[PDB]
């Protein structure tokens, strides 16, 4: 959801 | 859960490895300054760094062992702290400026509001690493310290907190590897490992006063902010 | 000056007997939350006094100017307490030991807004220490370590004392018998705690600050003075 | 002045 979650998710 | 496996020198490597680049600013010399636009500058690099850093996290020993959900916290805690020794480190050789970006060089004559007393605060620490003759393989240890320490205390089943440990106890022992490779005593590596550490005490300082003026420059909505940087600024919130 | 001449023993034993002592609360129940605040705004003022006649009391802190000493307490005392605070409550696992009369716990904390986090935070710190079987005489030195650096660059003599203090914390692993390795890991562990203990009186100082703002809980010229220093 | 400063020298 978070942004940060998304590009670490990546 | 190779981190553990890794000799240290093995260490140095891969995070010498993982090293993000240096971007540069968006500054023109041409364009008149103003409070607003240098600030502009400054968190549009911010931000631009972050993407970077956010893809060196996962290539820290470790960190990847870790679950996303603490990943996010552990960045979120220790983001600007990062940024900041980053930027103290390639400040060193330029006594009196900070090297925000090869072609932004400040002198902290900037000016700008509420921002003077860490540009002397970052100059110390940045002068304070250049006394200590600072190597850049002591500097990857330390910034992955901040990493995976600056976060440790806010995050159960707990043996990811254990892991981290762990790692970070590996950490230390390179750390200490690396000054006896440089030929210091004993006496004289536990007292540069002592002295590194306690500067974290004033990067954690100086983030914790950073996030403060970021609410503010939030609040007076004049200075543009990205929407990562907004998401990680209200994670402290 | 007399601080780089003292063995390890030596400084120990001086950082040891300038120990302040243990305050109480004032006595008589659920608190208020202007009730709890009073009670510790008060408890922190007088250990204030007796924490400026303990620094005195560090080698090494003497031998500053005046300026130099305001400056590290103004910018310390806040960690200094919490320390005091986290080590006195070590021996009392999920319970925060403000005095002998005075221990409060995570639950406690939601009567003041923000507060649950910090004491969170403090009882985190407390385990950390439990669970590392803080020694006193670690604790001392780490006390110590605090007042003299966190002022520091924000003002060299203070570098060398700190290497003494160093110096003596890997003195009294040696002596406990830990490794080589140990020693230099736990030092490591000791010292980055620093970091946290630093990060949650930044946090602390803020909400002082918005305490002041309010005029609600009563707080001494003295605690006023010290808040004013951060701002 | 600074009760600090007083404190301290006392
Ligand atoms: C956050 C910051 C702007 C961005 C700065 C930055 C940018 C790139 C980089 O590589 C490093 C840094 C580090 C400093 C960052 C500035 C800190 C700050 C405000 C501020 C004001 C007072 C005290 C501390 C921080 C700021 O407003
Ligand atoms: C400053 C403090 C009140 C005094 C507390 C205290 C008193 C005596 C002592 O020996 C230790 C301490 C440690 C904590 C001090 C409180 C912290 C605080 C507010 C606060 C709120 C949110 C987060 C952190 C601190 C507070 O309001």
């Known amino acids: 959801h978070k942004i940060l979650h998304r590009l670490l998710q990546d | ?45 911010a931000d631009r760094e972050l993407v970077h850093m956010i893809n060196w996290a996962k290539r820290v020993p470790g960190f ?7 990943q996010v916290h552990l960045l979120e805690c220790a ?13 060193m050789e330029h006594p ?17 509001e509420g921002m003077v007393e860490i540009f002397d605060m970052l ?7 250049r006394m200590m003759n600072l190597q850049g393989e002591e ?4 910034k992955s310290i901040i990493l995976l320490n600056s976060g440790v205390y806010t995050f159960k089943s707990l043996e990811e907190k254990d892991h981290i440990h762990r790692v970070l106890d590996k950490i230390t022992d390179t750390l200490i590897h690396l000054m006896a490779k440089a030929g210091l005593t004993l006496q004289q590596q536990h007292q540069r490992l002592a002295q590194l550490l306690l500067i974290l005490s004033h ?10 003026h970021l609410y503010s420059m939030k609040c007076k909505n004049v200075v543009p902010l990205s929407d990562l940087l907004l998401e990680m600024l209200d994670a402290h919130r």
Chains 1, 4 share one sequence.
């Open chain 2, 79 to 91: 983001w600007l702290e990062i940024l900041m020794i980053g930027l103290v480190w390639r400040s």
């Open chain 2, 1 to 45: 859960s190779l981190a553990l496996s890794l000799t240290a020198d093995q260490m140095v490597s891969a995070l010498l490895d993982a090293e993000p680049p240096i971007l540069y600013s968006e500054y023109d010399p041409t364009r008149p300054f103003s409070e607003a636009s240098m600030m502009g500058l400054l968190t549009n690099l």
């Open chain 2, 64 to 70: 990847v062992d870790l679950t996303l959900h603490d």
């Open chain 2, 139 to 142: 500097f990857v240890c330390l």
């Open chain 2, 203 to 212: 990067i954690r300082h100086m983030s914790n006063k950073g996030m403060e």
């Open chain 2, 96 to 112: 009196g400026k900070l090297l925000f970006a090869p072609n932004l060089l400040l002198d902290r004559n900037q000016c700008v």
């Open chain 2, 123 to 129: 100059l110390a620490t940045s002068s304070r690493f």
